[PDB]
Amino acid sequence: SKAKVAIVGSGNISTDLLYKLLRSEWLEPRWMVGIDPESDGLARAAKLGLETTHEGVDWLLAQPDKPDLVFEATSAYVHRDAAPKYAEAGIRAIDLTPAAVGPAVIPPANLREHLDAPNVNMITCGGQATIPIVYAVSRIVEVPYAEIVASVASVSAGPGTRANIDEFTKTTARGVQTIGGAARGKAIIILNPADPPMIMRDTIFCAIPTDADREAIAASIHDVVKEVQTYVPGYRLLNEPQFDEPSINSGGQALVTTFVEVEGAGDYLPPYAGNLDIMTAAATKVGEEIAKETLV
Amino acid sequence: SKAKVAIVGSGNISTDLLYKLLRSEWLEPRWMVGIDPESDGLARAAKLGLETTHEGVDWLLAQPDKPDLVFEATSAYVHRDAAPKYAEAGIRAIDLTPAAVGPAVIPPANLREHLDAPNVNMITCGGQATIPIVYAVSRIVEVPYAEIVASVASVSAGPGTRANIDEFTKTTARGVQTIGGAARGKAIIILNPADPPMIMRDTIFCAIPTDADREAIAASIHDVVKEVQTYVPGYRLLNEPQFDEPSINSGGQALVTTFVEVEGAGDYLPPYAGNLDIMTAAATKVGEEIAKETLV
Amino acid sequence: MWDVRITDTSLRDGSHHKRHQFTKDEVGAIVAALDAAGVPVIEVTHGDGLGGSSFNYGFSKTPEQELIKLAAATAKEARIAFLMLPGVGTKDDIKEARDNGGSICRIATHCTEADVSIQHFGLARELGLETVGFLMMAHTIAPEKLAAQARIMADAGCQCVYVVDSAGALVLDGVADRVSALVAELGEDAQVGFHGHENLGLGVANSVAAVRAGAKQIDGSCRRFGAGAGNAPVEALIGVFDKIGVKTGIDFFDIADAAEDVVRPAMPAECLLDRNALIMGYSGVYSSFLKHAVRQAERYGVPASALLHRAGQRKLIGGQEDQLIDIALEIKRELDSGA
Amino acid sequence: MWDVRITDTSLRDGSHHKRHQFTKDEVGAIVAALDAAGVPVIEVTHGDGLGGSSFNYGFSKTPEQELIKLAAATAKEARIAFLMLPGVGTKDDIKEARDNGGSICRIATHCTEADVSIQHFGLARELGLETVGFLMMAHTIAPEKLAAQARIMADAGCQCVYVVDSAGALVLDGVADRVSALVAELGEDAQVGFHGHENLGLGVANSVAAVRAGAKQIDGSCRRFGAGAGNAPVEALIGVFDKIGVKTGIDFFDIADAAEDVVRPAMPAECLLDRNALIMGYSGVYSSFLKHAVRQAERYGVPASALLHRAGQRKLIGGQEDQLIDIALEIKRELDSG
Numbered sequence A, B: 001s002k003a004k005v006a007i008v009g010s011g012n013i014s015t016d017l018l019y020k021l022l023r024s025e026w027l028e029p030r031w032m033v034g035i036d037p038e039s040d041g042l043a044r045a046a047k048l049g050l051e052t053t054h055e056g057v058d059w060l061l062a063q064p065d066k067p068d069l070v071f072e073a074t075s076a077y078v079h080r081d082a083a084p085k086y087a088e089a090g091i092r093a094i095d096l097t098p099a100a101v102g103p104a105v106i107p108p109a110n111l112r113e114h115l116d117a118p119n120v121n122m123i124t125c126g127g128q129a130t131i132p133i134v135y136a137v138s139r140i141v142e143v144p145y146a147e148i149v150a151s152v153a154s155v156s157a158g159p160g161t162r163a164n165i166d167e168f169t170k171t172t173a174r175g176v177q178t179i180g181g182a183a184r185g186k187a188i189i190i191l192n193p194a195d196p197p198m199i200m201r202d203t204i205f206c207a208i209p210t211d212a213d214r215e216a217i218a219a220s221i222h223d224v225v226k227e228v229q230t231y232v233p234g235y236r237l238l239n240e241p242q243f244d245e246p247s248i249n250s251g252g253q254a255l256v257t258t259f260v261e262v263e264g265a266g267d268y269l270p271p272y273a274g275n276l277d278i279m280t281a282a283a284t285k286v287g288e289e290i291a292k293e294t295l296v
Numbered sequence C: 001m002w003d004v005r006i007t008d009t010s011l012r013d014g015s016h017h018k019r020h021q022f023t024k025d026e027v028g029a030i031v032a033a034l035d036a037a038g039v040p041v042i043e044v045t046h047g048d049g050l051g052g053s054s055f056n057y058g059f060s061k062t063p064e065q066e067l068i069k070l071a072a073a074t075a076k077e078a079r080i081a082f083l084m085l086p087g088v089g090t091k092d093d094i095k096e097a098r099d100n101g102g103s104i105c106r107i108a109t110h111c112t113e114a115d116v117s118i119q120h121f122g123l124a125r126e127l128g129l130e131t132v133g134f135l136m137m138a139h140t141i142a143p144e145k146l147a148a149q150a151r152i153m154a155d156a157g158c159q160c161v162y163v164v165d166s167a168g169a170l171v172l173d174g175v176a177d178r179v180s181a182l183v184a185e186l187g188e189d190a191q192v193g194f195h196g197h198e199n200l201g202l203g204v205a206n207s208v209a210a211v212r213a214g215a216k217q218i219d220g221s222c223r224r225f226g227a228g229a230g231n232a233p234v235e236a237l238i239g240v241f242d243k244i245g246v247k248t249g250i251d252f253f254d255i256a257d258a259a260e261d262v263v264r265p266a267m268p269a270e271c272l273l274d275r276n277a278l279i280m281g282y283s284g285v286y287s288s289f290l291k292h293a294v295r296q297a298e299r300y301g302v303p304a305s306a307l308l309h310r311a312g313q314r315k316l317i318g319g320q321e322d323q324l325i326d327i328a329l330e331i332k333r334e335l336d337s338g339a
Numbered sequence D: 001m002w003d004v005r006i007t008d009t010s011l012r013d014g015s016h017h018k019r020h021q022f023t024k025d026e027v028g029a030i031v032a033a034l035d036a037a038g039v040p041v042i043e044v045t046h047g048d049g050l051g052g053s054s055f056n057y058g059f060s061k062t063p064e065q066e067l068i069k070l071a072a073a074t075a076k077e078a079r080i081a082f083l084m085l086p087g088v089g090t091k092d093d094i095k096e097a098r099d100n101g102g103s104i105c106r107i108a109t110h111c112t113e114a115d116v117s118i119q120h121f122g123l124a125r126e127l128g129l130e131t132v133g134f135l136m137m138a139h140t141i142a143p144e145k146l147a148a149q150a151r152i153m154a155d156a157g158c159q160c161v162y163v164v165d166s167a168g169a170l171v172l173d174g175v176a177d178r179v180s181a182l183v184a185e186l187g188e189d190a191q192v193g194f195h196g197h198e199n200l201g202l203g204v205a206n207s208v209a210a211v212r213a214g215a216k217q218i219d220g221s222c223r224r225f226g227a228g229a230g231n232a233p234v235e236a237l238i239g240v241f242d243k244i245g246v247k248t249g250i251d252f253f254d255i256a257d258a259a260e261d262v263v264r265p266a267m268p269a270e271c272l273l274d275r276n277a278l279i280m281g282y283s284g285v286y287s288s289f290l291k292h293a294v295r296q297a298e299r300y301g302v303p304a305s306a307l308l309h310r311a312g313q314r315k316l317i318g319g320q321e322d323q324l325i326d327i328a329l330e331i332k333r334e335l336d337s338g
Ligand SMILES: O=C([O-])C(=O)[O-]
Pocket: C013, C108, C134, C136, C137, C164, C165, C166, C167, C287, C318
């Protein structure tokens, strides 16, 4: 029996998420909750069999058959208002906004720790793409510092990241530490307007001991990449992990450098919107794992 | 008494020579011979009590009263035609043109050799200015190479120097060799258009042996400057002789460098026209020595 | 006072050439010398602005904040400027720089991406910082498009928007057309600046073109101290501006002495118009890529000229030095495979 | 074909920077590389032209005539040019350069002194040489005065008259006005060229201004290899001319390789925009004075910068290096007495 889930939000993210959820072995989207009766998102959900509404989250919380899971892609302010209502109603929430009222989760790194959480947060696209690599290195050796550089097509950066570019860099850097296991994290984001739009790519630099077991590190990275591929098929390693000795450039630190490319599934979002696709792919993954662990 | 001298030509050099002859204790100018009846030089001459003519040199050959000495500042063409006539008439000739039908004379160097000559040539202004310095060095040590650089106000350089600039450099270099005593000579002339017009200066470079007696050289240079000053009062050393060791610049040759400045008397020509002044002053000196020795 | 305000960026853009190895002794000496010469604005930061110290751009020998702090304590007349890039630095960094004595905040974005800086200009103005905006890689878009992005910065609180020839790729009229377009759009709302690189040997003349087109602020570095073949040399800008009747308040002889006696000894070598730099200027490659390309060339045994040409073809922009590694490996892969 | 003929003077103007120490091997390599990159004219002479080897300007390591001969035997497409200055070189030197395979005779006078070159252009044409005229120190007189002098040269047989910024002192419009004045005065009678130094960082731009004003010949040197802060860098010229649609026939990548791999190793160091060169540009000092001033500064323990500043005040012109010693002694006396 598939867990019955609701989607709050009716924009691009929500619509892409709807399509992924329809494909799910473990989840069944049944409700799409919006506020704009004009919303194209609500129209699409109706056509596909979902029950839709424009009276917002209060309408959802007054339904006889409560959702087992709720995915929210609205805004931090909106989800932060709704979150207490989900918890009282006993509905597990997966938050795709920057609200972060609940623990941030990256599936190959800390998802298992939080399967019982009533509210989980999907951090950032940069986090979802790069933190598994940082984790893959730090589970093998001490990583005093790790640095991620995200490169994204300008057209696939909406007003959200654009208005809050700092929060992206700070939040991602924080996840690199707390979830990635690096002692200090840094994140950089580059918006490139090249036409045709670039597929998102990410470079991950991790400081490692000068005597580090490089083969074990490389093997660990390959393992985490295959793992991420179970839920993001277009997540690809561009080169072997590259190793370097201490230098002026690296501030006397030995390091390993990993390059990934994140191609979207093209469900609703275009392939070059891997930054958005990875959010909805990761969210779906987290939802399915919760359903398997606590809901079946 | 005084030797009666004739000036042939009525141009700048001639008219300026006029004043130096007037102040001469051994020479008395009596004729200026011209071709242009309106020449500014002839008018000046006649005004100063000289007999003047416009018929040309042929007129001068026909006077009952024979000139003891004739100075010609016309052109190489004119002097060559006139030269044998002077010889036939038994009139000693001092040539300030590039004709050079007789030996070139520099007073401190080789004048004593040619006092008996029917025809002496005054070489060039650069020659009169610099060759005494080269001689001063070569009479002390072997000079395999000597180089002179003449800097002259553009307005002082007339049509003669300009039409025949190669001949100036070639003739001066040759004189630096044959009269100055350097095995090899080179001359450079620079016309500087600065306003107000520069006083002519010259730089003389002589290669010398590396073990050369520098004190004997410097003493010799000072002696020859004083000698030149007896007929060119505005002739002076700008600096003490400079001695330098073998270098890349000097092609591994040791050398002594001498800097002179030559200010004219301001007779018919302005003081910056020292290039024209030194010809007339030197020419007058030659005439006076000829008059002393061979005549009076 | 001046017709054009000169900013020296020997200690920011020059950090690229220095590979971010500046010491306090070097910054103090240079700030004092430039200050005494009359330079009104001295920029001090990591080459990639606040938060630049990293694997990607190179670690600083001395934390930039300490250098800004020392610069502000040294300068008597000059104001200290600092650069920051949204996506690299943060608002927290801007506040820290302000607290350390920086008084001019220069916020840089790729020329098409001005809207990411809106909050940064707002904060900077609220902290009482003078603002300058950089539209980087300005050769990549047309003048009217650049002017629209300048208007975004202006509306956000930007007091002067720069046309920034990051790749040293603009030629003369290309600078003038861009500067005039910004002047026409901004009018009285903001000044217009130009900051050029020397990769085609046109730093000084491009700056003159900008000034004639209406620019009131010009960047250079003493002794060209900067990325690529360098920035326009300030000592030469002053010489030329003196001759064309553009007042800067900088004494030519004093700044020449500073460039020669104080700035030069702090440089690892002269800034060269060499093959690599020329390629960047010809290919439109972001100038700070230069020494990173040389580094990857050594690391992977491929020619730096090739890395740089391909960076151009890939349309990489400021901040993307990491892709040079990917380009190096691509070359190694093609060499093995024979593709 | 081309819109502009580039002359490389790495091996002539660069002789100043090389201190006239070029060997046959270096000339052979450089000529070969420049020829291959498509450079149509390569100038080879002592920096001060034929007869330049001297105490005043510096002795050549290798006789210039042997360099011309080697360059002519090496170049398969490019023509070999050579420089001569009336009052330094002679008509005899010109004939010898032609005999040695030189095909382009470039005759340089101070810009107010063109009339002393008249018979030199005449002889050169008689010898079947293509002629170029250099009016040196061209910033010193108004464009109209410069144009009068250009007319003297053209009427003597000069086929292209250069505006020569010997001091690197012209700025942009200053070049354009001079080139325009010459183009207007010369018309069909002769082409107009530009030769600029880098003493104010304007070498390439001044060359662009010249071309836009009608110049059909431009001088530069690979890697700036030239007197003072250098000549306009040929490799940058080509890149820039490529962007603005001026055809030269020279491959940018090829000439970039030559500058980097062949010309540069033959340089004692990079040409520098240092304090001395900047002073020269700001003060209007003939570029070749640079290393001679530095030598005199060291010989007499006086600052080169002051020496060069005073060279400008004394209004020295090309060829007057000897006067640097006099200036050095003057500075030395002032110093020696507080
Ligand atoms: O320094 C800069 O910001 C540039 O050139 O883009």
